[PDB]
Amino acid sequence: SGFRKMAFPSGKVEGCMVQVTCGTTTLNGLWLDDVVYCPRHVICTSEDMLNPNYEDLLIRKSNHNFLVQAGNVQLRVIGHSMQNCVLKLKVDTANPKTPKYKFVRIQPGQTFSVLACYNGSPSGVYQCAMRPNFTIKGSFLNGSCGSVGFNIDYDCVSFCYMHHMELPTGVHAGTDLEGNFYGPFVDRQTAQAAGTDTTITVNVLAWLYAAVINGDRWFLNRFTTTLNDFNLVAMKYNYEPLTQDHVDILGPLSAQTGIAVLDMCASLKELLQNGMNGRTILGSALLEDEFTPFDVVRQCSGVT
Amino acid sequence: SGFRKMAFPSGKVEGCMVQVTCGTTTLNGLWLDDVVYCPRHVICTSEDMLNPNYEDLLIRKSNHNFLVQAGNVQLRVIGHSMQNCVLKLKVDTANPKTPKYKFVRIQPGQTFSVLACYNGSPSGVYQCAMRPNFTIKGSFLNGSCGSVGFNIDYDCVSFCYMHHMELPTGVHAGTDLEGNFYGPFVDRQTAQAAGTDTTITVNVLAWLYAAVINGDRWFLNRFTTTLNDFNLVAMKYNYEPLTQDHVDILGPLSAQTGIAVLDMCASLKELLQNGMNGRTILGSALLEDEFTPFDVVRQCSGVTF
Ligand SMILES: C=CC(=O)O[C@H](CC)C(=O)NCCc1c[nH]c2ccccc12
Numbered sequence: 001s002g003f004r005k006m007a008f009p010s011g012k013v014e015g016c017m018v019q020v021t022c023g024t025t026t027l028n029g030l031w032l033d034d035v036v037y038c039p040r041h042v043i044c045t046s047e048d049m050l051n052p053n054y055e056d057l058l059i060r061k062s063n064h065n066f067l068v069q070a071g072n073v074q075l076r077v078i079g080h081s082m083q084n085c086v087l088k089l090k091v092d093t094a095n096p097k098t099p100k101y102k103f104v105r106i107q108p109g110q111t112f113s114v115l116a117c118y119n120g121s122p123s124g125v126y127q128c129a130m131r132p133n134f135t136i137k138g139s140f141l142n143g144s145c146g147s148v149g150f151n152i153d154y155d156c157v158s159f160c161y162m163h164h165m166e167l168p169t170g171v172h173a174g175t176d177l178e179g180n181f182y183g184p185f186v187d188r189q190t191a192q193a194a195g196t197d198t199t200i201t202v203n204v205l206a207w208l209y210a211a212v213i214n215g216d217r218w219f220l221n222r223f224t225t226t227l228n229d230f231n232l233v234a235m236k237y238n239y240e241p242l243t244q245d246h247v248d249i250l251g252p253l254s255a256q257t258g259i260a261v262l263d264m265c266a267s268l269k270e271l272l273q274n275g276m277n278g279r280t281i282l283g284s285a286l287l288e289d290e291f292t293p294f295d296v297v298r299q300c301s302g303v304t
Numbered sequence: 305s306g307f308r309k310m311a312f313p314s315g316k317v318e319g320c321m322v323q324v325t326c327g328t329t330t331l332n333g334l335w336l337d338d339v340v341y342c343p344r345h346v347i348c349t350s351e352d353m354l355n356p357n358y359e360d361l362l363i364r365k366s367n368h369n370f371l372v373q374a375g376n377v378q379l380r381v382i383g384h385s386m387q388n389c390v391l392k393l394k395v396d397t398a399n400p401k402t403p404k405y406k407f408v409r410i411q412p413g414q415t416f417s418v419l420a421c422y423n424g425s426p427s428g429v430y431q432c433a434m435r436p437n438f439t440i441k442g443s444f445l446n447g448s449c450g451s452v453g454f455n456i457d458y459d460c461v462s463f464c465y466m467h468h469m470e471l472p473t474g475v476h477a478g479t480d481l482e483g484n485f486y487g488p489f490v491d492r493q494t495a496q497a498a499g500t501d502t503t504i505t506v507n508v509l510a511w512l513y514a515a516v517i518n519g520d521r522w523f524l525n526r527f528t529t530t531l532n533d534f535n536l537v538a539m540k541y542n543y544e545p546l547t548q549d550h551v552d553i554l555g556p557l558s559a560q561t562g563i564a565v566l567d568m569c570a571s572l573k574e575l576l577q578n579g580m581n582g583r584t585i586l587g588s589a590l591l592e593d594e595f596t597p598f599d600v601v602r603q604c605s606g607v608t609f
Contacts, residue, residue: 001474006428011315121608124310285589
């Protein structure tokens with residue numbers, strides 16, 4: 001029993017964290033084989049922040065203006081490329097603690113663990129979702145830049161996010177490990193707008209199934225609903241559209257509880273109409289959208 | 305910026321997790337130097353668990369009825385003692401990945417990270433607190449027994465909890481690593497239930513400070529109070545008393561926001577009576593008591609391990 005926002009064991013990633021310094025600027029880098037990936041804004045001074053020309057800033061740097069530091073050891077830089085918004089420093093030593101890994105670009109709604117770090121030193125680990133507006137609600141102070149997000153699946157670490165910057169709202173923006181930003185953001189200190197955020201409908205439905213599996217049926221009712229009629233009520237609450245794809249995905253969790261997806265859509269409709277009236281579901285006084293169908297299947301037993 | 309239930313990096317502990325099997329029973333063990341610590345109920349079958357005599361059950365076992373497994377490698381058991389409710393298997397090989405560590409008994413209200421494991425394999429990590437009723441709200445399925453709780457302080461892992469068993473109300477009971485149970489529970493298949501739980505007053509105050517630091521100020525008011533007046537309101541809502549010591553502990557967070565503790569106690573007083581009137585604090589409808597003052601200070605400073 002029990003349900004808890006559970007991050008992956010941070011061990012395989014801690015072994016890849018390094019410190020990258022460029023003049024006075026210092027943030028975190030990921031060290032995999034002989035390469036160190038980090039946000040390219042390491043090469044910006046306080047003046048360059050507003051309208052930086054990265055190619056011009058970078059053609060002015062040699063390898064020896066990049067101090068990579070793996071704990072106590074200094075690492076020797078022997079090459080520097082730039083891919084999109086990440087700097088790729090080549091180093092003389094391949095990371096002995098390189099895990100089995102791939103790079104993946106996740107979609108909005110999907111969850112990852114974050115390993116928050118300061119000076120190539122890990123401080124904490126927590127679970128996040130890519131919001132529909134492409135931001136993440138993270139915990140990140142100054143120096144946390146280049147902290148990475150990841151899933152682990154069978155000893156294979158899937159790096160999906162690198163932290164670049166905080167927005168005036170207090171939410172967080174970053175790139176995939178190929179340096180392509182998530183959302184319409186750029187590594188510039190120009191005012192950029194955090195798009196209007198929605199609740200991830202499919203993740204709430206999964207988390208209701210999770211409550212049924214942990215022995216709570218109190219929120220259910222005898223109604224059904226057409227996919228369309230739900231979405232028309234859903235969107236009135238700033239809930240993301242539910243697609244036929246979201247429905248197919250929830251099939252396994254519907255089957256294991258014998259509550260068809262659109263019955264569960266009705267339970268939610270009513271939950272939105274009413275609130276909780278002093279009850280809680282899985283320990284929460286509002287509806288949690290940061291648990292995916294996959295997440296629920298893993299954490300929750302086959303026994304209902 | 306931002307605030308998150310944040311656990312310690314699990315890597316130093318991941319290196320210590322192993323699989324302990326005794327006949328058909330299998331749960332998780334902690335491997336530090338040449339010793340493997342695990343719940344002693346590994347030596348019990350489902351029949352024995354009704355009223356087990358552990359000293360008699362254990363005098364029946366030789367070292368060769370204990371299969372310790374560090375990933376693929378088999379560890380050879382060369383000695384077995386007991387200590388309270390933990391079994392201590394001695395092994396032929398000292399764990400090369402043994403971190404700097406102590407064993408410590410935490411108080412109710414204080415927090416630790418848990419590394420959930422199934423078959424000596426770590427699956428996930430989360431933060432929880434020792435509740436006042438000595439239970440913990442964890443996520444544990446069958447085979448998660450011997451999963452450990454810990455804090456990290458600089459390089460030093462402080463192991464504080466070992467998972468033994470789940471209770472009727474779906475909360476969790478366990479020992480410190482010296483095998484002394486937290487709360488009035490026994491390692492036995494019997495009728496045991498969690499006492500009436502209280503909300504950890506000092507941790508809620510800390511988490512309100514955390515909200516003020518992250519911009520949420522709507523709950524503040526110009527009104528103050530005295531410890532005693534508040535404690536009468538606390539006790540009414542199944543909230544733990546607030547002591548002069550809890551107040552001194554909140555000193556740093558009061559100073560950094562210039563909201564004296566009893567000002568903040570007034571905000572809470574009112575929050576308890578009059579509701580949150582729709583609004584949320586740090587994206588929560590309820591008042592969160594599973595963040596300590598230390599926890600708050602650390603996350604809003606950024607100190608590393
Ligand atoms: C690593 C800092 C972090 O994650 O958080 C801080 C405070 C929350 C922050 O505000 N980040 C902005 C860093 C940044 C954005 N664009 C830039 C262009 C040049 C140099 C720096 C930047």
